Design goal:
This is part of a larger assembly, with 8 protein chains of 8 kinds. Chain A is α+β, with helices and mostly antiparallel strands. Chain A contains 5 helices and 9 strands. The structure holds magnesium ion (MG) (5 copies) and zinc ion (2 copies). One zinc ion binds near residues 11, 14, 27 and 33 of chain C. Chain G binds one RNA strand of 82 nucleotides through strand 1, helix 5 and helix 6. Chain A: This is Large ribosomal subunit protein uL16m.
Amino acid sequence: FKTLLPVPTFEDVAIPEKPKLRFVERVPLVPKVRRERKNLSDIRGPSTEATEFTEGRFAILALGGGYLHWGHFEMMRLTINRSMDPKNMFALWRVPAPFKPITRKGMGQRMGGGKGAIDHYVTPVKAGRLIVEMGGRCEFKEVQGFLDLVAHKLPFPAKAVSRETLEKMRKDQEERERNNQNPWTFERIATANMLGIRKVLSPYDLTHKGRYWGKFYTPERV
Amino acid sequence: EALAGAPLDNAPKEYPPKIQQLVQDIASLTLLEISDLNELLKKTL
Amino acid sequence: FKTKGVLKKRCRDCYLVKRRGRWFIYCKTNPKHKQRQM
Amino acid sequence: FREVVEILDGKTTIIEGRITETPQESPNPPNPTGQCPICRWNLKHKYNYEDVLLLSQFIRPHGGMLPRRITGLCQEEHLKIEECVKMAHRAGLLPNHRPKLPEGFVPKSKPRLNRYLTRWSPRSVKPIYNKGHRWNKVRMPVGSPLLKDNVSYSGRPLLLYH
Amino acid sequence: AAALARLGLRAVKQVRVQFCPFEKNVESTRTFLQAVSSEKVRCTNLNCSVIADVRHDGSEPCVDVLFGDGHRLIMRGAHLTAQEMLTAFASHIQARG
Amino acid sequence: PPPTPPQEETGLVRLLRREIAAVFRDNRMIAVCQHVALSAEDKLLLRHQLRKHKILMKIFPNQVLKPFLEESKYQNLLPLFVGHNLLLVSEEPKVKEMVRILKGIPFLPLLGGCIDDTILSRQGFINYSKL
Amino acid sequence: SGMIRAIVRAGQARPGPPLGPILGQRGVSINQFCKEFNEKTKDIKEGIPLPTKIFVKPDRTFEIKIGQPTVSYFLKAAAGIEKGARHTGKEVAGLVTLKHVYEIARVKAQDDAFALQDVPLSSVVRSIIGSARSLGIRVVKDLSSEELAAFQKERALFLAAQREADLAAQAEAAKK
Amino acid sequence: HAMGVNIYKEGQDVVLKPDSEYPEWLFEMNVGPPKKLEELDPETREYWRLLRKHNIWRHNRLSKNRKF
RNA sequence: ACCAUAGUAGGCCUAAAAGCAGCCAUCAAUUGAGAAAGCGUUAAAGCUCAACAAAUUCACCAACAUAAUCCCAAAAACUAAU
Ligand SMILES: [Mg+2]
Ligand SMILES: [Mg+2]
Ligand SMILES: [Mg+2]
Ligand SMILES: [Mg+2]
Ligand SMILES: [Mg+2]
Ligand SMILES: [Zn+2]
Ligand SMILES: [Zn+2]
């Protein structure tokens, strides 16, 4: 004998037309003819843009930083389009098209001579940026089950997250930070310049607070 | 209250005390009351 | 056998056993599911 | 303690269960409000592999272990008991709890190698042929990480990998 | 229930289960009776007869089987558990006959 | 331990409680049986053969049965309800045609029961049947 | 040796499919079953399909038991339609009253599955209404004055709907 | 077979009894909307049957990712 | 571990679509069981899950080979250490 439990009933969920993921382009319709410098600050540091949900209730959260290109976009599009139900699910891109060009020199020739030819296009993704946001009238478990295969094959580490899971790990980070037992922390050392640590540390580390080093983000850092 | 203890056939010897007290209440009566009792029982059953 | 990095059951009759310090998928009905962690 | 007796008397098999008197718990624990048997007797972070008198309490006569539903222990301390019983068994303690097979004691082998604090099994460890330098060293584990929470009277941590 | 069904109990002739339901130590006997009286065990062979004797003051929970190796297995389950009774029953009655 | 959280009885639990109260109130014959897994055809034929003389049968979970029958006047039936069980239900008790069913199949035990606020055994049911 | 569930029409029992490969796989003679089925069924002149249980035996003989007919043919004969609804819920198949469902409830009260059940007539009328929920025929409590106008409208409406469906099917077959 | 129901053919195809012969409970039950979870009383066995059916629906939706 | 019986080949298309190439409904029996969550068939048949009833120690993710002359201080889990 066991006791029954109430099922979550979703009556306010509206499925928009064309619930599948929109097809993205290899190259944007206007090509960039000017070759610009490869900024790494679009990978470095925490994400500021599109860190929150808009319509859907599930997402792919990026724990690390990195570049996404047309192979990864086709991967996500094909995998979600064959693994979801169009009647019960809708999906949405939270990332733009590949717009930053990445160039290559014709391999085998010497260093110098100038810039190379434009090879492909990528999108920079920081840590904490949502990639694909999904909504529907069903639970998180099957959505997590088919989104972990998508999130595993991405370059940066990634997770299948919900609204409750994202707030759970965020307030977990806050309670760990306010339940620090040692009196010495990265903020107190770096902002006050303790032991002349700014000679070794970066000026970006005052904002990063030691949780970010390059493109790598460690959530256990506090 | 509580129910009976349900004795079994291995050592059945305990008759209910209600039966014995009804037998004694019958046996403490005269024959005019025997006839009245028999008439009142024949009328009911 | 198949030597693998992560182990999973390809059917419900497979079982986990720790032998010789390593983890084993052993299956009786389908012997093709025999897998060994590396 | 219940034992089963199987009797063969002329194509008739009789299987019976008999109760033998069992020892009881000691009357006065020092910490009566504790739930768990170790954690109410204040032996948490105290016992080791050497404590034979306590490891003999939660074991079978054939060297087996009793389940946690019977023993009543908390899960981490049950795992600590299991690791310490395994360590004592490979260390050569509890000699009377081996099973009896009289045909097998007579064919002697090479003498038993004296050992203690064995986290792993003797038969499943590969020899470290390659070893390593100081900047990458393959360290032989001695003792178990489940027992790092014991008290340190010297104050130094217990070196588990050497 | 499945262990007796897989093992081919067609070599068994007679089963009887004599118990007193008003006692406290007969639940293993009831579980063993429900194991030997399940559907697959019953349809393993139709020539085996099972008897469920119910008493009150018999004061002995017991099971007794006869099978055609000349053998009669009688075991009084009062302190025995149902798994022990099933294991001993199978490991005797399939090894003999 | 922390202080005990008070578990709330739900609508299903209360519905089964008043169902047990009703079947123990209005009926004259309540019989206990050791429930045996049968063929499903044999089960439904058994239901029809009990419909032939108006006796019904239910299964009630012991999780909601045992405390109610421990507070009730039928506390002596608790050793018959430790294991798997079945409840036989009659208005107007007549037990020749029920024991005729229970002797036609040899492996459905009759453990006990209560007829007219008196608790009887299987041999007591047999004597009450011949009476 | 096994069980076969076969829905066979009343006056047509033939030594061919689906009775051929199903019953001939068991090793049972088809002509003997056809003769006995025709003999048992020929007293019913209604022309109604029957679900039948064939218990094929290990000695290659057979036993036959006849049950009550199908809810689909019952409600199709009650509503006067030849086929069921293509899209259940988007459209209605037919219109009947409660008297058809109640009569079908008394007919199916002697079925092999439900006569062995002890359930009342409310259970079987709920079963037939629940079958109608997927079969597409919607019942009405009291339509007896209104069902004349309802049939007079709905026959013309469903004639237009069937003509449009046939035209769409012909256009789809031409474009495919 | 094919049969068309008319003014005479809908009443002569069967035995059309008066409404007073018929009970109350065929008129009692609903026709077109199935009962939902919020409508039914919580102390009704049909409510718990509907909740159990929703639980099997939830379990079937959860078990769509089976690897076996 | 334990157990699986009802309308019912739910309605269309199709040579066949019997829970299960596809589309639409997703009702209704028995305390108990989804017009069916996985295997299987040409179509079936059949084997499993959920549901009763029997009980209940805990159960969310995590583990991943290698090079060439000969491996590379020896070794140590507790006598008190800001
Ligand atoms: Mg990756
Ligand atoms: Mg139901
Ligand atoms: Mg199950
Ligand atoms: Mg290799
Ligand atoms: Mg050296
Ligand atoms: Zn396998
Ligand atoms: Zn403890």
